[PDB]
Design an enzyme around this catalytic site. Structure first.
Site, short mmCIF file in Angstrom:
data_model
loop_
_atom_site.label_atom_id
_atom_site.label_comp_id
_atom_site.label_asym_id
_atom_site.label_seq_id
_atom_site.Cartn_x
_atom_site.Cartn_y
_atom_site.Cartn_z
N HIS A 16 2.56 9.06 5.14
CA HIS A 16 1.45 9.69 5.84
C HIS A 16 1.72 11.18 5.98
O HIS A 16 2.88 11.60 6.12
CB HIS A 16 1.27 9.14 7.25
CG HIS A 16 0.92 7.69 7.31
ND1 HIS A 16 1.88 6.70 7.31
CD2 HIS A 16 -0.27 7.06 7.40
CE1 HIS A 16 1.29 5.52 7.38
NE2 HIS A 16 -0.02 5.71 7.44
N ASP A 39 4.00 11.70 8.77
CA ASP A 39 5.39 11.29 8.59
C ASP A 39 6.24 12.45 8.09
O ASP A 39 7.43 12.55 8.42
CB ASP A 39 5.52 10.14 7.59
CG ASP A 39 4.77 8.89 8.01
OD1 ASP A 39 4.66 8.61 9.22
OD2 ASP A 39 4.33 8.17 7.11
N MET A 85 2.12 7.40 -4.19
CA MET A 85 1.01 7.15 -3.28
C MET A 85 1.28 7.90 -1.99
O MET A 85 2.43 8.05 -1.57
CB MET A 85 0.83 5.64 -3.02
CG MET A 85 -0.32 5.27 -2.07
SD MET A 85 0.15 5.43 -0.32
CE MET A 85 0.96 3.88 -0.04
N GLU A 97 -7.08 0.05 2.02
CA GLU A 97 -6.18 -1.00 2.46
C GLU A 97 -6.85 -1.82 3.56
O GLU A 97 -6.98 -1.33 4.70
CB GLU A 97 -4.87 -0.40 2.97
CG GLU A 97 -3.95 -1.38 3.67
CD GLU A 97 -2.69 -0.71 4.14
OE1 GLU A 97 -2.46 0.46 3.74
OE2 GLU A 97 -1.93 -1.34 4.91
N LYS A 103 -7.65 -4.55 6.56
CA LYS A 103 -6.96 -5.22 7.65
C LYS A 103 -8.04 -5.81 8.55
O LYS A 103 -9.03 -5.12 8.83
CB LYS A 103 -6.08 -4.24 8.43
CG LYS A 103 -5.10 -4.91 9.37
CD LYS A 103 -4.19 -3.91 10.10
CE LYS A 103 -3.17 -4.68 10.95
NZ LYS A 103 -2.33 -3.76 11.80
N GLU A 157 -2.68 -5.82 1.40
CA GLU A 157 -1.38 -6.07 2.01
C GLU A 157 -1.21 -7.56 2.27
O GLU A 157 -2.11 -8.19 2.84
CB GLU A 157 -1.23 -5.32 3.33
CG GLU A 157 0.13 -5.58 3.96
CD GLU A 157 0.37 -4.74 5.21
OE1 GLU A 157 0.19 -3.49 5.18
OE2 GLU A 157 0.75 -5.36 6.22
N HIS A 176 -1.91 -8.72 5.85
CA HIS A 176 -3.25 -8.49 6.39
C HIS A 176 -4.22 -9.59 5.99
O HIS A 176 -5.03 -10.03 6.82
CB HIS A 176 -3.78 -7.13 5.93
CG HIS A 176 -3.06 -5.98 6.54
ND1 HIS A 176 -3.39 -4.67 6.27
CD2 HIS A 176 -2.03 -5.93 7.42
CE1 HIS A 176 -2.60 -3.87 6.95
NE2 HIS A 176 -1.77 -4.61 7.66
N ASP A 223 0.59 -3.64 -1.20
CA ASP A 223 1.55 -3.59 -0.11
C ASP A 223 2.20 -4.95 0.04
O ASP A 223 1.49 -5.94 0.29
CB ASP A 223 0.89 -3.21 1.22
CG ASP A 223 0.62 -1.71 1.34
OD1 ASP A 223 0.93 -0.93 0.41
OD2 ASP A 223 0.09 -1.32 2.39
N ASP A 282 0.18 -8.22 13.45
CA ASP A 282 0.68 -7.74 12.16
C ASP A 282 2.20 -7.63 12.22
O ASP A 282 2.74 -6.76 12.89
CB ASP A 282 0.01 -6.40 11.88
CG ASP A 282 0.29 -5.86 10.51
OD1 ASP A 282 0.44 -6.67 9.57
OD2 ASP A 282 0.37 -4.62 10.38
N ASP A 308 4.58 -7.38 9.55
CA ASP A 308 5.23 -6.49 8.58
C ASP A 308 6.69 -6.87 8.36
O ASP A 308 7.57 -6.01 8.34
CB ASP A 308 5.14 -5.02 9.02
CG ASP A 308 3.71 -4.48 9.01
OD1 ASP A 308 2.82 -5.13 8.45
OD2 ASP A 308 3.50 -3.38 9.56
N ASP A 340 5.33 -2.23 2.63
CA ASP A 340 4.85 -1.74 3.92
C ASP A 340 5.36 -2.73 4.95
O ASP A 340 4.68 -3.70 5.29
CB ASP A 340 3.34 -1.61 3.94
CG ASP A 340 2.83 -0.95 5.20
OD1 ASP A 340 3.65 -0.58 6.07
OD2 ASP A 340 1.61 -0.82 5.31
O1 LIG Z 1 -2.50 4.56 6.59
C1 LIG Z 1 -1.80 3.72 5.68
C2 LIG Z 1 -0.73 2.91 6.39
O2 LIG Z 1 -0.67 3.23 7.76
C3 LIG Z 1 0.42 2.55 8.34
O3 LIG Z 1 0.77 3.11 9.54
C4 LIG Z 1 0.02 1.11 8.59
O4 LIG Z 1 1.10 0.39 9.13
C5 LIG Z 1 -0.32 0.49 7.24
O5 LIG Z 1 -1.23 -0.58 7.40
C6 LIG Z 1 -0.95 1.42 6.20
O6 LIG Z 1 -0.44 1.16 4.92
MG LIG Z 2 -0.08 -1.04 4.87
MN LIG Z 3 0.64 -4.66 8.24
#
Ligand SMILES: OC[C@H]1O[C@@H](O)[C@H](O)[C@@H](O)[C@@H]1O
Ligand SMILES: [Mg+2]
Ligand SMILES: [Mn+2]
Ligand SMILES: OC[C@H]1O[C@@H](O)[C@H](O)[C@@H](O)[C@@H]1O
Ligand SMILES: OC[C@H]1O[C@@H](O)[C@H](O)[C@@H](O)[C@@H]1O
Ligand SMILES: OC[C@H]1O[C@@H](O)[C@H](O)[C@@H](O)[C@@H]1O
Ligand SMILES: [Mg+2]
Ligand SMILES: [Mg+2]
Ligand SMILES: [Mg+2]
Ligand SMILES: [Mn+2]
Ligand SMILES: [Mn+2]
Ligand SMILES: [Mn+2]
Lengths: 386, 386, 386, 386
Positions: A53, A56, A87, A180, A182, A216, A219, A244, A254, A256, A286
């Protein structure tokens, strides 16, 4: 044994091994990771690449100066290791401004800000080599029925995705987008809740060829759905741009978990499908090392992701390569499934008395599918019992 | 009070009030109903029309002679009452021949038979006035991962639906098709498991304009999904050709309770949406009077379906008509949701400093959505507490 | 390899391999099996024994004469094979009279009939050697909230179980009772829905030592619960009198897949627990060969049940026997879990400054649990990857 | 209309209206609330009392001096308002030290610390007037099967609860304990996952009369269970010491919506049961104003909790008071459910030919339960449609 190499195309989000362990009911159990250290430790484990992200990699609210320094450090780590960045994605969920969504926030000025935040990071993603840009609309939805006009929300969601597609077209970028899905969490219900809903929505966009899905494991399983089936339909539509991988134990929050945990047999059939269909995109994890773990457990959990993929890959390959399994597939008429139902055409079908008037319905009903024997061959291979 | 009339467009399957009460663990608790008696009793209750499977109206394996007699009796009941038949469907699930599917059975000859069975009943449906022909692929799927190549199965499913669309086009019929999704039961996982998956699949068909969805309340809830949200997306796509109304208490076997039972608040928001969007198709009840009931309970349960729709219709209308609710909707910026995000265009957005550089993210974050006050107004209206 | 023998204590209900394939949406795909043939075919497969409902062995409404003949045939098959009958149960669910329950039907005369039906079959069970008599209250419950006063229903359920315990005490029988919990289906909600609810209810009975649980893999998973955890708590209470083994893929209708299918990792941890705790009761398979199968598939599915148990048994044994796993268990402090928390006593704990005032909370927080490395050792063993 | 007063016994946790909005995917949207302000604002809304975790009232790691000041401020607010404190609990989940549990942490020194933390707050609870002390073992459990020996964990859980019971007995305290079950989150599976499991566990404690359950609406619904049924069984066991009221939309993460939201019909039947059974404990709301809300929405959401209880209370009272409903209850034989099945005794039952040999099973099967008409009367009352 089962040692990953970059050709396996295993990738990890910075936020995965870097998850500090804060959950709804508890504080962080681990210190924050420097993205540069993650790039290096992941490269040593045999990973192909990393994802991120925006927030991040560059802490939210960073000046141009600090932003530059964070990006330069990161690119240097990518140069030292040869790690790729296939990605990237936008954080449109953490900051309190996104509490009602990004692209579909009721507040118009938030929606505009969401788009500007995403467009800035698309530029960086393209620079770093990303072929896919992921949208996870984690905040798009509602907890109560009156809070969100869902037809208007889908208008706004289409408008945003169309604007992003006009932006990459105007820049001459090759990057494509992947939604993605969810079904819920953190919103009570999230818009585009499954692979199916995301695929359908894409077909109403202005440039549908620019958009695919990033499904994912956990999800779709949060909706009780069959993840290999949904992946099959994504492949059938030509829309599996990315994926994912992780683990999830049924319908609950969720989780993960590391890939391989959770629904192990579904993981087997997923790897069997990906390999058989020749999926060539990233195998992206993920996942979140459980907060019970210290840093050594973080890297063991990440290694376990790749390890379980490679074991399952070998089991599915042996399954498919087994003459006894090939014979079982014929006994279950998987080959007849591949034959056109009526390539002779509608009129021939209508005049074909063997398809109705003279169809011996009871003899056909009595033919056993032999599905159990085939599945026990699959089970035998998965467990190494052959 | 709340007495249904034919203008309310309430319809029922012959198999609904006619369900004899056989379930996985028990024998029938009720005698079989004559379709003619169902037409009459439903007409007396205020229903608009009836629907049927081929095998509800003509017993399976009927000669031409007996088939004719069953159809003539039925049409006479429709003439005596003015009852309409807006929708019909094929039974591609009861007979043991369909144990691995109809359109996607591994056995090619079963797939051809499935299509001939469906085409025969399309002719009858068109004759009786049906505007929608429903496909529920209840047997399309698998219990084990190796039994069904899902990409090949979707090939066969597309091939069958394309053939049906070529057939109605060649006959000059106005009838359109509606896929009724279901995530599971009787198969472990069913193909096209939700509204989203069905909508996406339709866009790969040769003549997509001929195909929509017939979503069922309980089926999306069996995946834990938000049924009003999925209906909203179906309306957004222009694909809500038909709808199945009933009740379901969460994620478990398909209950088919009378509409209003199960998730009452979801039923409220569903009726609010259908009425607000001006849905004009049938309000069809695909429900089963619980096997605890005798024949008087069957008709009470069916009456309860229409009754609960009409009460909820009045509650949602009063909710929307309330000035206090209109003000609450503005306080929650539902009106801003309807405004284009960036009708000034991409370049204007990119140069709009108020959308990023000068966006006061914290002031916007501090603006409460006021969603709880709005939902408690909705709750007050639903319960008559205003 | 992995060939079952009678010492493995594998047992099957007559209704399992004998399931004809009728489901809510379809007719039987298989002819009915003669119980004598099932005894023989199961004995050839290596099974230890068989179980039955009264109405599996004697068709409902049988005269004394016919009843005798059915029982004599059956006992002769047991004599020819040495097959045992460790458990029997009553069909209190199929006949329409039980549509609102047996022991908790609102109609008092049905409740009395339920008890007389059960008592008759207890006599036969005891004669044939059964050590456990199972009660599955599949019809005890409701679809709507007003239909069942649940406190009164539990009064009636206690009264019935107390009467059965007085009956076996008065006859000098050694047989004990086991409640088989199920959360739902065929009732919308079933009373005593999980292992926990059944265990709690037992403690209010007059003679609690006569009652335990017969938990089923799929039934606890229909509530999303952890089946090994519930078995552990049943073992902890000393109440695991019997167990039903099968497979289930998450929260949906009761699938009754062959054991090993469904949640494979949960099956591994279940076998690990049963073997480690020295469970010595029957390993009973309450499963249904999917209706896609012919008779050869029925016996393959039943063989697969025992086969998967024996593979998992070997994997868990190797896991536990591995020195690397023993070291991992110490690294995760599983041994400290077994140590009394405060055998020094309450006052010593209260005066122990190292337990609070001087407890270094942060050093303890920083100690990683090493759970992921241990689980990947478990995964490696399960998949044969060591 | 529907204005709460202290006689309604409505109580709220400090952590409920004081929830700052941090969730797994986002930062706080609201500033922290001073407990003194919460006491006052809640008193103005008509609440009866407040509850707290130790760490809600005294920040973790507080010296004796600061602890005293926080407690004195709080007691003064209770004196100014007359607000009561009927229940308190321990935070054994937030601090990273509890990442593997409190009472069942694998690390023995953590288990001892857990007990000392709880005992300190029991003293304060007793001082402030609490009649119930709640244990929510949110961290007791596992994400992977090998991490937790569940029989040993239950040993440790019994040991801790026995020590707490010895402590209150030694102090002459009147306070009783209530276990609050939860099936999962934040652990993958939590020990004692439902009301049933908690009730069963209590019966193995040294002093079972000191322990009951504090069931939460949303938690049993996270297992798909019927919350009124579980409450009925808790009342039947005499163990409903306390109750947590909120809303939950099916099987997903713990939503903690305001009471009345989520499963509205279940909320109706819950209030009907609590009032009919004469439950006299606190009506405690363990809910979280959604993070979309500002402070005004927090108090509107809390008011909505009490409001929905009082509306539902009036609807259920009118339902039960309706002569048409009383007649419907007789038509469905709810009165026969209350009659002993066989108060004439076992021998009389065995000799009663009308209970078996001469029982007309078919006439009894043909008697309809009339459940649908009764439920539609319940629906009519709930919606105000009578
Ligand atoms: O925005 C994309 C990603 O955000 C992450 O914080 C979430 O855990 C994921 O569901 C997603 O792949
Ligand atoms: Mg994800
Ligand atoms: Mn998840
Ligand atoms: O085939 C169409 C219909 O078949 C019925 O038997 C099923 O219960 C419904 O899900 C469906 O509407
Ligand atoms: O009554 C005991 C048995 O009845 C069977 O028909 C059900 O499938 C099982 O759940 C149960 O073990
Ligand atoms: O410890 C008691 C309480 O802790 C809270 O933080 C949790 O949200 C509740 O489930 C519980 O009532
Ligand atoms: Mg339907
Ligand atoms: Mg069973
Ligand atoms: Mg709580
Ligand atoms: Mn249905
Ligand atoms: Mn079962
Ligand atoms: Mn909760």
């Amino acid at each position: 044994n089962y040692q990953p190499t970059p050709e396996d195309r295993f990738t990890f989000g910075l936020w995965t091994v870097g998850w500090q362990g804060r959950d709804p009911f508890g504080d962080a159990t681990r210190r924050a990771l420097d993205p540069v250290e993650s790039v290096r430790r992941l490269a040593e484990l045999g990973a192909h690449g990393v994802t991120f992200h925006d927030d991040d990699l560059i802490p939210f609210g960073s000046s141009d100066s600090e932003r530059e320094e964070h990006v330069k450090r990161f690119r240097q780590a990518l140069d030292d290791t040869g790690m790729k960045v296939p990605m990237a994605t936008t954080n449109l969920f953490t900051h309190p401004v996104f509490k009602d969504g990004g692209f579909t926030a009721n507040d118009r000025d938030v929606r505009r800000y969401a788009l500007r935040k995403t467009i800035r990071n698309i530029d960086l993603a393209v620079e770093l080599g990303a072929e896919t840009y992921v949208a996870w609309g984690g905040r798009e939805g509602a907890e109560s029925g009156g809070a969100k006009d869902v037809r208007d929300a889908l208008d706004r969601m289409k408008e945003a995705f169309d604007l992003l597609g006009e932006y990459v077209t105007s820049q001459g970028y090759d990057i494509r987008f992947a939604i993605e899905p969810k079904p819920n969490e953190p919103r009570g219900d999230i818009l585009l809740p499954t692979v199916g809903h995301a695929l359908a929505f894409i077909e109403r966009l202005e440039r549908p060829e620019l958009y695919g899905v990033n499904p994912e494991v956990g999800h779709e399983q949060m909706a009780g759905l069959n993840f290999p089936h949904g992946i099959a339909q994504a492949l059938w539509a030509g829309k599996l741009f990315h994926i994912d991988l992780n683990g999830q134990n049924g319908i609950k929050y969720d989780q993960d978990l590391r890939f391989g945990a959770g629904d192990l047999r579904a993981a087997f059939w997923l790897v069997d499908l990906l390999e058989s269909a020749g999926y060539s995109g990233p195998r992206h994890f993920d996942f979140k090392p459980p907060r019970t773990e210290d840093f050594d457990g973080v890297w063991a959990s990440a290694a376990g992701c790749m390890r379980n993929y490679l074991i399952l890959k070998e089991r599915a390959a042996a399954f498919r390569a087994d003459p006894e399994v090939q014979e079982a597939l014929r006994a279950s008429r998987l080959d007849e499934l591949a034959r056109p139902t009526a390539a002779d055409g509608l009129q021939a079908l209508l005049d074909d008395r063997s398809a109705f008037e003279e169809f011996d319905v009871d003899a056909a009903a009595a033919r056993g599918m032999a599905f159990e024997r085939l599945d026990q061959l699959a089970m035998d291979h998965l467990l190494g019992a052959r």
